[PDB]
């Protein structure tokens, strides 16, 4: 019942190998920066990232110094002394390793191919968990394609079976080992496995939606990267879910998936809740602790919805770290991404940025009038609306990328914990606004309705409603003599 | 040679009191089919037989068997004048087999199991041999999804038996044939559309009931058998988009434009869009009768007007209001009139005007004083339907029914002339600018040319590539998957 607050702790292999808690030049965010107060505000820390090797087993990256790796992980599990309920999970995958064109992509595909490969892979996940002292497994494959989905599902079920046996063997009933995955937060990648969402979520404790990065340099016009609700003035997109292999009829597809639609956090959450068998309590909303920056924008609407000239490649070519005042962008060699920590310092600098607010999307943005820069990010104010949304929709909690990007005081994490748990915070009157809501209707969110029982032998007119086998149905055309479900002439429109 | 299939319908009461010298008892005896007419037909479908509660093909129980044999003998005697003429028998029809029909349960149960199908199939061959028929036609209107696999298995079973009987009887020169009557409009066609290739495989022909596309059941008057669409007329919901095909939204939308014009061309093109349906097995049905409407406004010759015609089956006494229609009084229904009777009404001074619609290529009658509209076909509309049959390479024509032609047999003569006369030339007939059905599906994908797909490439929106036999187009951008592996690709053409 306590909402989950899942923070990623991302540490590159080079920083593990040279770990140190006293030189921010080498390790910007050491474990010691996670104080007892922050440890009590978290429910899960996702250590990232591990990978799947050529032997099709969960494994640390080959360049990892195992003695150092163990030392970092032990410092994380030590945090449990301050919060007995905290779980240190490990994440496998991430964009770099697992995307279609990623370095280890083939290992993900092959690991879940056969009954034999799956068993071996599942056992290796439990082995790494026990050997290093982790509390559970998170898999971040971005993302399995339609043909790989059945194998993925079978592999999750196998891991669930082994974790459940391990929880009993280890006497962990009070804090069972858990299994989660990161899921797409936008329709284009979600369409890959959408038709099997219920089977994917069944063995999980949570599915952590990556409801951010919804706007990037790969887009034609600038936009908010995590708009909660839509702005009619902003761009709209093709609803890729209408093309998923669902087997539904044209009317069913059209009412579930309006197109074009606004690519927002609310749309991703509602698309998951439209599927039958997907409980709201397992859905976790992801939020970013960073902003994305664009250059070459136009004046007019504060940099919003403007064409721009930002390079979209990985990586980026030394050309000016044009992000004014972002020192962090210089050591990371990319001015397109900045941590909230860096953003805060840029705002209260004398750099020339202005903080503006979009009251439909309920998100802030920075505009640099002089240099034509646009930055979309989230802060403690946008989090009020997202936390209220989580509570109203009865979602499982929130997840964020990533811990090292919060400011020194841990203000972003403290805000989320306050909105869910503080006795002196009350959002009963917070105005959620008039932004556009996703209005598709699917099997999972049909309205409850009342209708007279279907009577065999009866001829029905167009638009007639009847109740049959737990649902209310409506005729799509006239003179119908067939029963609901036996004919393509009936459309399921309600339940009960 | 194109098929010319005429139905000869004779009700049980006429068989029982059969006579060739009293039109008050039998309006159209077999003697009306002269050697000239017999040479113009390739098949006569005697109708109708039924399926009894023992799940065997049988004559209506009220039938006097001796009289039934005598009528069938008079029909088979015609083979004297035309050695290639086949006398088929038809099982079913609307009265016996519609969902609410008296014998519907027998059709459904006869196809349920291997045993009931073997018994039923055997009974069809037995009746065929015992009475001297040349083949079997089944007119079940219409099996519903669940029944379709059983119906397909029953057709395969009958086909094996006929093929064997052909050998047995040394009929290799005029083999026994199997046909069915199929729906000529999308509403009923949607019941079995997805399995159309399987249904047609065992048949010599599928005879489409491309008439009765307009009637008192509709709120606006319209042509019952328009060849092409008139943009000024009504449009309808395309029910095929609701068939259980399993196609994506884009595929359904491209194949099934909606609303669309309910025409003969639409029904034919809808069949040709499915893979595995050869044009040579498709037979176009035409009516030898007209449908009348009363209470029509005056705007456009009574076309596309509201009306006050009752749609119930048994009509209610009230004025046989179709002026000059004597047949209507005897048949107690003023809503349908044989061509023979329409011709007489046009020759009398009753006030009808014969008008022509150059988009639909069909005639219609309008009565200004009484506000009457009649939609029918004649020798002129048949020129366009015959040319369409030749252009589209269909198997031939079918018509309902022989007894409605005029005494000289002008409609049948016209059809024979358009397909076979050496002195008829339709090379210059203008097919008009009426609306053509333009859906694209699996069976009519165009040959297209495109660069081969290259793995490792990221494709932009709208890109075209050839891969595994087809040309595919991306539906959104940044595609890293291979065609056919996720939902981002749309099949748009075939590779040569």
TrEMBL record, chain A:
It is an enzyme of class 3 (hydrolase). Residues 4-423 form the GH18 domain. One of its GO terms (molecular function) is carbohydrate binding. Gene3D superfamilies: 3.10.50.10, Carbohydrate-binding module superfamily 5/12, Glycosidases. Keywords: Carbohydrate metabolism, Chitin degradation, Glycosidase, Hydrolase, Polysaccharide degradation. It catalyses: Random endo-hydrolysis of N-acetyl-beta-D-glucosaminide (1->4)-beta-linkages in chitin and chitodextrins. One of its GO terms (cellular component) is extracellular region. Disulfide bonds join 326-329. It comes from the Bacteria. SUPFAM superfamilies: (Trans)glycosidases, Carbohydrate binding domain, Chitinase insertion domain. Its EC number is 3.2.1.14. The keyword Cytoplasm does not apply. InterPro entries: CBM5/12, CBM_sf_5/12, Chitinase_II/V-like_cat, Chitinase_insertion_sf, GH, Glyco_hydro18_cat, Glyco_hydro_18_chit_AS, Glycosyl_Hydrlase_18. One of its GO terms (biological process) is polysaccharide catabolic process. Belongs to the glycosyl hydrolase 18 family. This is chitinase.
